[PDB]
Design a protein around this ligand. Structure first.
Ligand SMILES: *C(=O)/C=C\N[C@@H](C(=O)O)[C@@H](O)CC=O
Ligand SMILES: *C(=O)/C=C\N[C@@H](C(=O)O)[C@@H](O)CC=O
Ligand SMILES: O=C/C=C/NC[C@H](O)CC=O
Ligand SMILES: O=C/C=C/NC[C@H](O)CC=O
Lengths: 257, 257
């Protein structure tokens, strides 16, 4: 339905970028307006590591101490003084949105500067990672940090993942995780036609009801995915989000393909 | 290695019950001593629902309100005022150890009395569920509540799941979740031979460093599983656990098969 009355109905701000990878058709809406990506970003870092270490070599183990640990690390919280593979870091970041995992992933990639570096290669001028977890999810309308526009985010997802340089194996490992993740069932997955396949990574910033869902959406009987970025936020710092907002946005946009 | 020097080395209390379903061979240790099962119990309730609703009918939706919500419900915490299927309740309980999910599952089964009822049918005289989440994980050496012995727990897992009445579909849905769960990689999975398959559900009570791992373990090249229950605890209320304890217990016990 109209995104505008979604915005009215929900009293929210919608940012949408959809790309049909088969056809190259796009559906934009508030497309160049900046929003906090929060955890959606875990998919990018993940893919960036994935490019740099073959599947066979994800068994590689890294050491975690107490200094490594940040909030909301359901998986990694138990690894103080132990090793975890690259494989399990990604699993934890992707399925559980594990904040230490993400941090260690950026670290393995070579830090934020390395991410910044990749982005630019991708011709991603907008995505602006500045902080580490959990501060990278601390949205303020007044700051550009850890923001992107649905378009820049979307273009990058396309370039890294869908039409990227990943190996069969690495591409499959990453997409499966995004496909199996039950974490965002109330988001895009909730709004698409019944026999569609959704490989997403959701996110939520602490403030302004910042709620997001990013996905590779496979139409019932379609191999190439539709890249879908939906960012949402609201007026007040303490506003809570309505996930049904994203579900209904997804529902509408999908109509156009 | 010897469980006794595991116990010395870790200054912990070990409770082990292993059953080779092929052969019927058991490995017991402090087998009839009671421990808090905590989240391991999510597997039982899950299986109990699974017996009662065909796979095709897990799409069945149930309504969650705010009254339903308990602590540490990473999935269900977002469902206030919405419906979730039976399928996704189980997914959330199993993969994320989702406390509201578990609660709603027991509720769908018909409550604790119904669980108590099933147990007895199973000839499970010991497992003593008394509370709901999150209190069912509040261990005290002095209370029997939400306790079982590695044997009674183990026997029941065998009877419900391994050698149970589940359908192909329901049995596969449940085992896959336990197999895909990266949550207990530092436990049993950490101690078994490299090419073994482990379908577990881990748990941890608030006190006495109560740490557990329950699994269906498939020897590299073996179809029938070994049922493995490892319960561990320590002397002081505020003791924290060493997961490596379970990994090394698993490592040892597996030697015998
Ligand atoms: C990240 O910005 C927001 C949420 N990540 C979530 C997810 O992917 O499920 C999450 O559950 C972790 C805490 O919100
Ligand atoms: C239950 O008694 C203890 C832990 N459940 C965990 C699991 O299965 O991963 C968990 O992560 C939830 C909070 O400890
Ligand atoms: O969007 C991704 C969120 C991931 N981790 C949970 C938090 O960071 C808690 C709020 O800061
Ligand atoms: O063992 C399973 C634990 C599951 N949920 C987390 C808690 O209950 C937190 C401690 O009470």
């Amino acid at each position: 339905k109209e995104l505008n009355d979604l915005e009215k109905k929900y009293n929210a701000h919608i940012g949408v970028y959809a790309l049909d990878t088969k056809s190259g058709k796009e559906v934009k809406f508030n497309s160049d307006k900046r929003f906090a990506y929060a955890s959606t970003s875990k998919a990018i870092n993940s893919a960036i590591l994935l490019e740099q270490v073959p599947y066979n070599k994800l068994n590689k183990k890294v050491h975690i101490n107490k200094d490594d640990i940040v909030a909301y690390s359901p998986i990694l919280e138990k690894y103080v003084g132990k090793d975890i593979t690259l494989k399990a870091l990604i699993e934890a970041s992707m399925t559980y949105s594990d904040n230490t995992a993400n941090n260690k992933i950026i670290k393995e990639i070579g830090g934020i500067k390395k991410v910044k570096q990749r982005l630019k290669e991708l011709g991603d001028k907008v995505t602006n990672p500045v902080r580490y977890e959990i501060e990278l999810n601390y949205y303020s309308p007044k700051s550009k940090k850890d923001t992107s526009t649905p378009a820049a985010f979307g273009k990058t997802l396309n370039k890294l993942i869908a039409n990227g340089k990943l190996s069969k194996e690495n591409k499959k490992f990453l997409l499966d995780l995004m496909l199996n993740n039950k974490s965002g069932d109330t988001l895009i997955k909730d709004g698409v036609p019944k026999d569609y396949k959704v490989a997403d990574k959701s996110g939520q910033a602490i403030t302004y009801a910042s709620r997001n869902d990013v996905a590779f959406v496979y139409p019932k009987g379609q191999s190439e995915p539709i890249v879908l970025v939906i960012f949402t936020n609201k007026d007040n710092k303490s506003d809570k989000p309505n996930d049904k907002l994203i579900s209904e946005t997804a529902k509408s946009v999908m109509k156009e393909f």
